Structure formats: C-alpha cells, structure tokens
C-alpha cells in the first residue's frame, strides 16, 4: 500500500489544505502554506487528528510507517510548493522549511524504558525529565558539492571534489536527555533516561528538569537510504524529538469522606509506620510533602522551599525515611554527602560521542526543579558542595561563570537533610558547630532544625522494643487502627492541597506579628543559642501557608499560626 | 560566463559602482585623501548608501567576497587613474564600522555564512601573536626544480597543498619572498546585557588577520564588523570521515528619549529624588535607607537584605559582577592564571574584576578572603588596575571599576563604604519590619536611563561655588576630637561627585556636597565607637 500510493497523498495533501475554510478561505494547514512560501513560518507541525476524522489512512498508516508517511508527507510538500509558491533536489527544496507532527492520544508520551524493537520506525512521543543540554551547532545535511568542470549546483548527502556550503542544506541541532519523571518508577529500578536526537527550532528552547512533550520521530528526509528498511550498515534510531513542549501543568470529602478529618492528626497515624513516633517531625515532612510550591500572586517565591535539616544519622535509622520520603516524594531525589561531586546536585560539562558538544547535565538539584531535595550526610558536602547549596538558598541558583557556559539553571526544590554530627554523637555540652560542624551560617538558613537524640528513655525504648518486636510479627507497625493508604492516593490527597494557593485574612496581620513579636522577643530576651531571623517570619508564614493547604481553607487561620507557633514551641530545643 | 558557486555575473554590477564612486559626491573629499595622503582601507558604515543604488547594495552581503575584490579593484581602477603619481602602492580593503543590524550571532543561521556581519559582544581574549603560513613552492625531481605551489598564483591556500618541503617555505619563504602569513584569532563573547538568563550567548572563533591585528583588546567593548567563515570538521585529519558541522570562524573586517528626558527633567527638577529614589531604592526592605542611598551614588547577619541589595545592584545593572570569597577566591575576580589544557599554554585567567572595569563589584564574604588573595585588593584599590606580570602576557589590567561588599584590616581606609547591620532590638520595628512583610504578604528602567545620561553626558565641577566648602569641610570633619586630611576629601569629592552626576548639573554647591557630609559622617558614626 505504501510505496505506490504517491498520487493519493499528493492528491490528499493537494486537498487537505483545501479541506476547510479554517485558514481564512483555506484550511489551517494551508494557512501556513502561504506563510511558508512567503517565509513567514518555516517549520511545520501536524495535528494528525484532523486527518483521521475523514481518513485514518496516513494516521494509522503513518503510525505503522512513520518514516514513509514522514518521507511521503515531504515529497508531496516538495512538489506542492509551486501551487502556493509566490515566485535531485532543486536548491530551495524545503531547505530551511520543516515539518513536525502531533495529534491524538494514539501516540501517548511513552516511557524511556519502553522504547523497543517495535519502536523502530515508530511514531513516537514521550514525556519525562530533561537534561544533557548540549552546545548547539548548525549542522549541514546535504553536501551541495561541485562538479567544477560542469558548473551549476550538485548535491550529495555525502575526491579532488570540494564540498561547499553555498547551496547545502543545514540545520541547528542539539543533544538532549529526557529522563523518567521520578513518578512512574515506584520501583527497585533506575529512573531511566535517554540519549535524545534534537533538532530544528526545537533547539535553543528549554532547560533540563522540565516535564515536557516530545515526538521522537524520524525525519522525512530519508526512508532508509536508496531502498527500503532492510540495509547492511545503519546507525541508531535514537529519539528524534519533534514537538518538544513543556508541561507547565498537566477523593473529596464532599463525594467521599476523606479530607474532613485532620490529616495533621490523621496523616501522621497513616504515615511513617515503622517510625517510632516522633510524628512531630513528620509534620514538617508532611508540610514538605505538601510543600508550598503553587503560590498565590503575593510574590512569595520562597514559599516553595521547606528547607529542613535533621541532625545525627542512625537516629532511628532516619537514614531510612528519606527513601520513605522519596517513596512518598515524586519530583524527588536522594543524595549523600561524599557520594559524588556537586554534580550529584549541580551540573558539569564534557564531550560526548553520539551527538551534541559538551552536554551540561546536572544533579539532583538540577534534577529537582521545585522538587524534594534529600540528603545524606550534609556535612560531607565539603566546601564545594556547601556552596551552590548556599546559593540554592536563593532558588534558581545553579549559576555558571565558566569560559563557554555562564548560565543559571532553575534549582527550585526544597531541602530536607541528614547530616552526621561532628565526629561524635550529639552532646548538650557541645554546640552546633561543635557537635555539629557544618556552618551555623547555613543551618540558620534552614526553615527548621530538628534532632533525634537516641537517648535512654527505657520505656520508650521498651516501646521501641515493642515497636520492632511487633515487626517480624507482621507489618502492623501502626496497629492502633490506622488505615495506611497509597502514596499516589496520598499524592492525590496532597495535590488538592497544593492547588489551594491560600492567602491570609489580612486581619490576621496582627496575630502573626503579634506573636512573632513575643516569640522573637523571648528568643532575643532569653539570649540562648537559639537564633532566628525574618526568614523566620517567612518560614513561620510559610508553614501556616502550607498548614492551610491541608486545612483546606484557601486563606489561613489562627490555628495554623498557633500550630506553627507550637511547631516553633516544638522546635524549641528540637535540637 | 558565471560563478554558479556564488551566482555572480561577469562583474555583474561593476560599472554601476565605478560611476558610484564618482556619483556619491553628496566620497569626493575622501577619493583623493586615500591616494594623496596615502590612507587606504575604506571604513564604511552599515551601508546607508542604499538610498543610492539597490542592485549595487543588495549584493553587499550577498556573495560579496567576489565583489569586495572587484571593489578593491574598482576603487583602484578609479583611484589609480585619479592620482597615479602619489603613493599608489597603498591598496585599499574596506573596513566597515557599526555595520548592518546583525541578528546576534547566537541566532544567525547555519546558512548565514557569505554574510557581512557585526558583533554585539565583549572580548574574552586575543590570539596573542599567532599568524600563519603564506605561500608555497615545493621541490620536485628533474634535478629537483623548486616548484611554486601557492607561490603559483591561481592556486589555493588549502590544507595539504603545502604537504612537503618545509624549507622550500621555511627558509625559502625568506629566500623567495612569501614571508609567512597573517591571521589573528580572538575569543569574544556576544552579550546582550539582559539576555534571557539562563541560556547563554556565543563566544567567537575570530581568526581574520589584518594589521588591524591587536587593535581589539581583551575585555573590549564592541564596534566590530566581520564576515563569516567555517570549515567541515573532520572525524580526524588522518581520515575523510566527516563531522557534518563546519567550524565557524570569522573574517574580521572592521574598522521617545527626549520625552523620557523631559520626564527625567521633572525627576531632575524634582528636589528630593535622593530621598524619593531612596524611597524607591531597594524598596524590598524597611529602614537602613541610609545604606540604600550610596548605591545610587555608587551607581553614579547573612544575606540580611544584602546580597539582595547587591543583587538589586546586580539586577539593576549590566555593568557589574556578583561574587564572594570562601569558594571563589581572587580567581573569581582576577588572577585565575591558567592554561588552555587542550593546547597546554597559560592564559590570562581572571574573573569578575576583569568583568568589572568601569563597573561595580559585588563581593561578599569579605571577611573570608585570604592573604594569598586580598593582597590583590590591597593593591587594586590603590591602583584601579592590576599588574599581571605573567608567563605569556606580562601586563597590567585596568579595572577602573567600583566595588562594594560586606562581611559579618587596617585598610578599611580604601573602601567605597559599607555599614553596620546591627540589632535595633525593637519589637515594634520588627513589627514594622513584619508589617513590611505582612504587607508584602519602570522606575528601574527610568532609573536605568537616569543613571545613564549622566554616565553618558554629565561632568561635575566643584569650583569656587563649593570647592571652598570641601576646604571648610574636612576641617570640620577632622577637627571633632582633634582623619579627613587623608583622602576622605578625595572620597568626599567622590561623594560630592554624585549629586552633580545627579541632576544633570555639571557644577556643584554646598548642598550636593553637604549631603555627602552626613553620609560620610553617619558612615563614620555608624562605623565609630
């Protein structure tokens, strides 16, 4: 059916621009065609849904043969020019004029692991997380070469001969790396990520980390080369991304009976099951598991960051929960102090083989655009990795000042941290910067500090005995009647809270400052090691600013400020 | 007869241009100035000439590599006939100045090669001296004749056209007059100054020669015209397999508001913009307005509004560079001296301070600086330039800049000035601060040009209007508790420098000096114990 229906698709393409009045007495696809010959728009995309409404041929067929119905979409477009033209391959032959594809959910954005031997020749879309941003170049496609004895232009895609640019066919291209979303991997596997083939005006377009669109799809320029798909020497089908597009944005107690009762009571009793109590900490984890990213327009850009540090590592095996957190937390990545370089968080550059020069690829922070940032051993992130941290204070903070590259990337996540205590366990006689050793100067910056003194409370130990001894009896770690949940459901229980975007009753403007006065009054009055800031006020606000997301008020209430106080009162010698 | 490789007819517009050189008249003053004085090398503009002739014109960029020759001929066809009894050995090659509106070579096409272009950029560095081979000759073997190759006119400056008999240049080149060629690399940096940020601009593979060699310096600002070239990247010189990108490198061939002003004039007429802009400046915070003041002038607890302000400066301004100690040493400012390891040769490696000449430095963590560094700043500030006596380029580095920073060394003496973020210990002011945030929970571009036109146009003069007052002043500033007989005057004038750099008034009085008293006074007081 494919190799010899050339007249149809040309007939088809001869009529599809004519198939409507939506391009102003022309079809929308023909709207561009006059804009094409006039060089108004040069690249093209295709919503293939418009074809299947009258002819799923070239829709299911292109889905069966992307290449051919790619290539055949062109060769009509090749000879279709004179019909709209305002004036081997003649020189102009779509030479700066390009074609992409789009349409129904028959090409759902697929998984980096799910590329296949079936995916060869396939119509191919993907979403996921970005990195490996190469240095763009221009790139020739056709050696418009010279028959010097003969004169006029000659074209090879490929001795005394010269190969000369003046008629050759070029493109601006890159390498990219899509990555899994960190969301469809509730798994004991690596979040996969892919070498991407990247071109056109869809280069110089976007940054790492984005959740995006793709179409990883072959070019019309060649079917296979001189013949059908069978060949003897062949480089790789990798992801020929067409239509890369950002994802800005993709269980109710009213219909169900769910969000009615306090998650800030209840969610504790159904999160952190193995954990030996101390849900108080979990609240901020709950708060961070809510985060504060989705803001209302009051310019609170620091709302997104719940920047917590936890101090001392075999604290209950608090080492564990960050996985639990990441088991909760999508858009989330875990790292350790001295496990890798700053590019565990940050980014760096060198050559690659496949395509693209010096791909900047980045770490968790570069991976965590508004993510959840989870650390082991914050202390071993020695001065280098102490630093972009100390920038990532400031949200979009992966800044570069290097010869060829001097960008910043959008480090926008929020930070929970595990840091061993200074060569020895916590000590009341030794201070932070004596029992801790990391900068107070940083620790200050954290929204909250909390420690877990593994201490001789023999009864709670005896509970912990009871706690663990219940384990390997079963996994009923919260046997006081709590019904656990799906972290997705929790995520669904989270997401509705994220979208609240509250904003306080300004009459409350006293109640915080009212308290923050007395609070900071007492702290500066008390003159102990505890030291706060105005980021306190932000943090204080910012806590309540998330407390009401669960307490789905869309505004803020006294209790959250009283709770966030109580958190601070609970934070009071949380170290 | 045609050049299909570039589609130019046999001279194809020539005889329009010969008359052009005589028909431009209102050149005719310049037409003899080249032959009679002996100053070749035309220096056109973005060629406005397009009011004369479009068929001449449209070609100008078009494939004009086959035309500029004909020009450098066609001029000389006329010019040698104009004054052949002058110094006519001064052949002419054009050198445009502020050329056609380049599409920010960041954005130019893969296509965009045979194209006269111009930079909007900044220099990263120069070649320093590396020119290259000119012309050939081999020896063959019928009693070995020394065979012209690129000495043979009509042949090409290829690679491998000179693949043998090096002395048949490398000595003979002296003995046979092909003394080797001439070309100058530069690494520049496209920089639109309010780029989108993150994504970054295009540095330059400059190479082209002419004895405009070195008349572009490192760090330089741009007025610069060129033409594109590139070359396909071999998979290896050992092979013919192809990296299908051409290695760009460029033929250097270089050399509303009044209504806003009227608005500025109202702002200039406006009497307390020092307060109003202060009320506008760094608005993000409540009091410490006093601190906020001098940034305008200087324009002219960790991060406790500080980097914010410095970022306010960073944000406000193209000319400046933010950094700090403790991870980034002097190197992030200067003296990062180090090599191109791909080539293994030292480079004048530096930093923000080299980004900062006629700029404003936003250091932080000034407490954290070493003595292996910060002896830099011991030397810098007493210079405003930096002697780099080094391996490949012994030099000094004009950093005629500005600085400010703050930290949490006998030479505070130097500083522009920084202040004491101390605790008012007032819950009410906190509440006022809180209210400032609880309330928290254009002027710039106007400012951006307010600062400018004075940086463009204005030049204060502190004469007997108030030159006396300085003399009256440091008397008053030294004497209380009797130092200001030191350069405090030179600071004071550097403060009184501002208000007349404000106001579009090039002349000064006690007021517009006298404010700077309070500043240096309060700055002394707040810094005093």
Swiss-Prot record, chain A:
Domain MCM residues, every copy: 263-469
Enzyme Commission designation: 3.6.4.12
Subcellular location: Nucleus; Chromosome
Biological process per Gene Ontology, one example term: cellular response to xenobiotic stimulus
Crosslinked positions (Glycyl lysine isopeptide (Lys-Gly) (interchain with G-Cter in SUMO2)): 11, 24
Segments carrying motif Arginine finger: 444-447
UniProt binding sites for ATP 2: 445, 535
Phosphoserine sites (modified residues): 296, 431
Region listing for Interaction with RAD17, in residue ranges: 452-495
GO molecular function, one term: DNA helicase activity
InterPro entries in the cross-refs: AAA+_ATPase (IPR003593), MCM (IPR031327), MCM7 (IPR008050), MCM_CS (IPR018525), MCM_dom (IPR001208), MCM_lid (IPR041562), MCM_N (IPR027925), MCM_OB (IPR033762)
Reaction equation(s) it catalyzes: ATP + H2O = ADP + phosphate + H(+)
Pfam family name, one: MCM_lid
Keyword Acetylation appears in the UniProt entry: yes
Binding site for ATP 1: 276, 315, 317-319, 420
GO cellular component: chromatin; chromosome, telomeric region; CMG complex; MCM complex; membrane; nucleoplasm; nucleus
Modifications the protein undergoes after translation, according to the UniProt entry: O-glycosylated (O-GlcNAcylated), in a cell cycle-dependent manner.
Keywords for this protein: Acetylation, ATP-binding, Cell cycle, Chromosome, DNA replication, DNA-binding, Glycoprotein, Helicase, Hydrolase, Isopeptide bond, Nucleotide-binding, Nucleus, Phosphoprotein, Ubl conjugation
Family to which the UniProt record says this protein belongs: Belongs to the MCM family.
Complex and partners: Component of the MCM2-7 complex. The complex forms a toroidal hexameric ring with the proposed subunit order MCM2-MCM6-MCM4-MCM7-MCM3-MCM5. Component of the CMG helicase complex, a hexameric ring of related MCM2-7 subunits stabilized by CDC45 and the tetrameric GINS complex. Interacts with the ATR-ATRIP complex and with RAD17. Interacts with TIPIN. Interacts with MCMBP. Interacts with ANKRD17. Component of the replisome complex composed of at least DONSON, MCM2, MCM7, PCNA and TICRR.
Cited function: Acts as a component of the MCM2-7 complex (MCM complex) which is the replicative helicase essential for 'once per cell cycle' DNA replication initiation and elongation in eukaryotic cells. Core component of CDC45-MCM-GINS (CMG) helicase, the molecular machine that unwinds template DNA during replication, and around which the replisome is built.
Other comment: Early fractionation of eukaryotic MCM proteins yielded a variety of dimeric, trimeric and tetrameric complexes with unclear biological significance. Specifically a MCM467 subcomplex is shown to have in vitro helicase activity which is inhibited by the MCM2 subunit. The MCM2-7 hexamer is the proposed physiological active complex.
Name assigned to this protein: DNA replication licensing factor MCM7
Taxon lineage: Eukaryota, Metazoa, Chordata, Craniata, Vertebrata
Curated annotation (Swiss-Prot), chain B:
Domain MCM: 273-438
Name of the protein described by the UniProt record: DNA replication licensing factor MCM4
Subunit structure: Component of the MCM2-7 complex. The complex forms a toroidal hexameric ring with the proposed subunit order MCM2-MCM6-MCM4-MCM7-MCM3-MCM5. Component of the CMG helicase complex, a hexameric ring of related MCM2-7 subunits stabilized by CDC45 and the tetrameric GINS complex. Interacts with MCMBP.
Annotated keywords: Acetylation, ATP-binding, Cell cycle, Chromosome, DNA replication, DNA-binding, Helicase, Hydrolase, Isopeptide bond, Nucleotide-binding, Nucleus, Phosphoprotein, Ubl conjugation
Disease linked to the protein: Immunodeficiency 54: An autosomal recessive disorder characterized by severe intra- and extrauterine growth retardation, microcephaly, decreased numbers of natural killer cells, and recurrent viral infections, most often affecting the respiratory tract and leading to respiratory failure. Affected individuals also have adrenal insufficiency requiring corticosteroid replacement therapy and may have an increased susceptibility to cancer.
Modification after translation (UniProt): Sumoylated; SUMO2 modified in response to stress caused by inhibition of proteasome activity (in vitro).
Residues that coordinate or bind ATP 1: 414, 487, 490
Function: Acts as a component of the MCM2-7 complex (MCM complex) which is the replicative helicase essential for 'once per cell cycle' DNA replication initiation and elongation in eukaryotic cells. Core component of CDC45-MCM-GINS (CMG) helicase, the molecular machine that unwinds template DNA during replication, and around which the replisome is built.
Organism: Homo sapiens (Human)
Full-sequence range covered: 150 to 774 of 863
Entry-annotated residues carrying N6-acetyllysine: 54, 265
């Amino acid at each position: 059916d494919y190799a010899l229906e050339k007249e149809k698709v040309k007939k088809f393409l001869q009529e599809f621009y004519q198939d409507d009045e939506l391009g102003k007495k022309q079809f929308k696809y023909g709207n561009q065609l006059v804009r094409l010959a006039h060089r108004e728009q040069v690249a093209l995309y295709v919503d293939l849904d418009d074809v299947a409404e009258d002819d799923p041929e070239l829709v299911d067929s292109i889905c069966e043969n992307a290449r051919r119905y790619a290539k055949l979409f062109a060769d009509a477009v090749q000879e279709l020019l004179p019909q709209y033209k305002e004036r081997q391959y003649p020189a102009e032959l779509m030479r700066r004029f390009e074609l992409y594809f789009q349409g129904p959910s028959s090409n759902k954005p697929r998984v980096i692991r799910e590329v296949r031997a079936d995916s060869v020749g396939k119509l191919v879309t993907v979403r996921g997380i970005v990195t490996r941003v190469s240095e763009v170049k221009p790139k020739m496609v056709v050696a418009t070469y010279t028959c010097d004895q003969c004169g006029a232009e000659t074209y090879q895609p490929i001795g005394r001969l010269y190969l000369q640019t003046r008629g050759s066919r070029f493109i601006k291209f890159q390498e990219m790396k899509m990555q899994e979303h960190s969301d469809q991997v509730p798994v004991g596997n690596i979040p996969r990520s892919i070498t991407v083939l990247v071109e056109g005006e869809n280069t110089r377009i976007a940054q790492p980390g984005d959740h995006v669109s793709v179409t990883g799809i072959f070019l019309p320029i060649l079917r296979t080369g001189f013949r059908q798909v069978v060949q003897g020497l062949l480089s790789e089908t990798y992801l020929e991304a067409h239509r890369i597009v950002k994802m800005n944005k993709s269980t109710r107690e009213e219909l169900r009976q769910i969000a009615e009762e306090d998650f800030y009571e209840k969610l504790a009793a159904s999160i952190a099951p193995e954990i030996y109590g101390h849900e108080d900490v979990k609240k901020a984890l709950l708060l961070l598991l809510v985060g504060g990213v989705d803001q209302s327009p009051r310019g609170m850009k620091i709302r997104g960051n719940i920047n917590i540090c936890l101090m001392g590592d075999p604290g209950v095996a608090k080492s564990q929960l960050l996985s639990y957190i990441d088991r909760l937390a999508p858009r989330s990545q875990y790292t350790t102090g001295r496990g890798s370089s700053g590019v565990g968080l940050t980014a760096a550059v060198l050559r690659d083989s496949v395509s693209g020069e010096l791909t900047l690829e980045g770490g968790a922070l570069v991976l965590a655009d508004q993510g959840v940032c989870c650390i082991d051993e914050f202390d071993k992130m020695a001065e280098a990795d102490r630093t972009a941290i100390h920038e990532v204070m400031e949200q979009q903070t992966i800044s570069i000042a290097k010869a060829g590259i001097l960008t910043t990337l959008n480090a926008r996540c929020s930070i929970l941290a595990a840091a061993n205590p200074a060569y020895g366990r916590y000590n009341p006689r030794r201070s932070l910067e004596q029992n801790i050793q990391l900068p107070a100067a940083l620790l200050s910056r954290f929204d909250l500090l909390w420690l877990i003194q593994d201490r001789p409370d023999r009864d709670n130990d005896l509970r912990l005995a009871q706690h663990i001894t219940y384990v390997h009896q079963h996994s009923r770690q919260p046997p006081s009647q709590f019904e656990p949940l799906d972290m997705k459901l929790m995520r669904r229980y989270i997401a509705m809270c994220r979208e609240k975007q509250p904003m306080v009753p300004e009459s409350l403007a006293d109640y915080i400052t009212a308290a923050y006065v007395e609070m900071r009054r007492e702290a500066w009055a008390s003159k102990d090691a505890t030291y706060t800031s105005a980021r306190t006020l932000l943090a204080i606000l910012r806590l309540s600013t998330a407390l009401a997301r669960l307490r789905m008020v869309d505004v803020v209430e006294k209790e959250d400020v009283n709770e966030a106080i109580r958190l601070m009162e609970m934070s009071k010698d949380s170290l | 007869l045609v050049i299909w490789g570039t589609d130019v007819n046999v001279a194809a517009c020539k005889e329009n241009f010969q008359r052009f050189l005589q028909r431009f008249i209102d050149y005719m003053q310049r037409l003899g100035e080249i032959n009679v004085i002996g100053e070749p090398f035309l220096n056109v503009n973005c060629e406005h000439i397009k009011s004369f002739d479009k068929n001449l014109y449209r070609q100008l960029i078009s494939y004009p590599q086959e035309v500029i020759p004909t020009f450098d001929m066609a001029v000389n066809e006329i010019f040698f006939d104009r004054y052949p009894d002058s110094i006519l050995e001064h052949q002419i090659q054009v050198r445009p100045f502020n050329a056609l509106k380049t599409k920010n070579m960041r954005n130019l096409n893969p296509e965009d090669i045979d194209q006269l272009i111009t930079i909007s950029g900044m220099v990263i560095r120069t070649s320093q001296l590396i020119p290259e081979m000119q012309e050939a000759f081999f020896q063959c073997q019928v009693c070995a004749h020394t065979t012209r190759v690129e000495m043979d006119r009509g042949r090409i400056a290829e690679p491998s056209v000179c693949g043998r008999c090096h002395t048949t240049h490398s000595m003979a080149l002296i003995h046979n007059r092909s003394l080797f060629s001439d070309k100058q690399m530069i690494k520049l940096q496209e920089s639109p100054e309010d780029m989108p940020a993150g994504q970054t601009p295009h540095t330059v593979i400059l190479f082209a020669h002419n004895d405009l060699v070195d008349k572009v310096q490192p760090g330089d600002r741009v007025n610069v015209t060129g033409i594109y070239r590139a070359v396909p990247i071999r998979v290896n010189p050992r092979v013919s397999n192809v990296k299908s990108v051409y290695k760009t490198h460029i033929d250097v061939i270089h050399y509303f508001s009044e209504k806003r002003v009227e608005l500025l004039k109202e702002l200039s007429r406006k009497p307390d913009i020092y307060e109003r802009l202060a009320s506008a400046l760094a608005p993000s915070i409540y009091e410490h307005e006093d601190i906020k003041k001098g940034i305008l002038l200087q324009l002219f607890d960790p991060g406790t509004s500080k980097s914010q302000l410095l970022q306010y400066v960073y944000n406000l301004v193209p000319r400046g560079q933010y950094t700090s100690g403790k991870g980034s040493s002097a190197v992030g400012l200067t003296a990062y001296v180090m090599k191109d390891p791909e080539t293994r040769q030292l480079v004048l490696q530096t930093g923000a301070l080299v980004l900062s000449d006629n700029g404003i430095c936003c250091i932080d963590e000034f407490d954290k600086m070493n003595e292996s560094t910060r002896s830099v700043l011991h030397e810098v500030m007493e210079q405003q330039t930096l002697s780099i006596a080094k391996a490949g380029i012994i030099c000094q580095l004009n950093a005629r800049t500005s600085v400010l920073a703050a930290a949490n060394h006998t030479l505070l003496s130097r500083f522009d000035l920084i202040f004491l973020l101390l605790d008012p210990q007032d819950e009410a002011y906190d509440r006022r601060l809180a209210h400032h945030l609880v309330a928290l929970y254009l002027d710039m571009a106007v400012l951006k040009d307010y600062i400018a036109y004075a940086h463009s146009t204005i030049m204060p003069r502190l004469s007997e209007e108030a030159s006396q007052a300085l003399i009256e002043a440091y008397v008053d500033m030294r004497k209380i508790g009797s130092s200001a007989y030191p350069r405090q005057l030179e600071s004071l004038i550097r403060l009184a420098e501002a208000h007349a750099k404000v106001r579009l008034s090039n002349k000064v009085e006690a007021i517009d000096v006298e404010e700077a008293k309070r500043l240096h006074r309060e700055a002394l007081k707040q810094s005093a114990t």
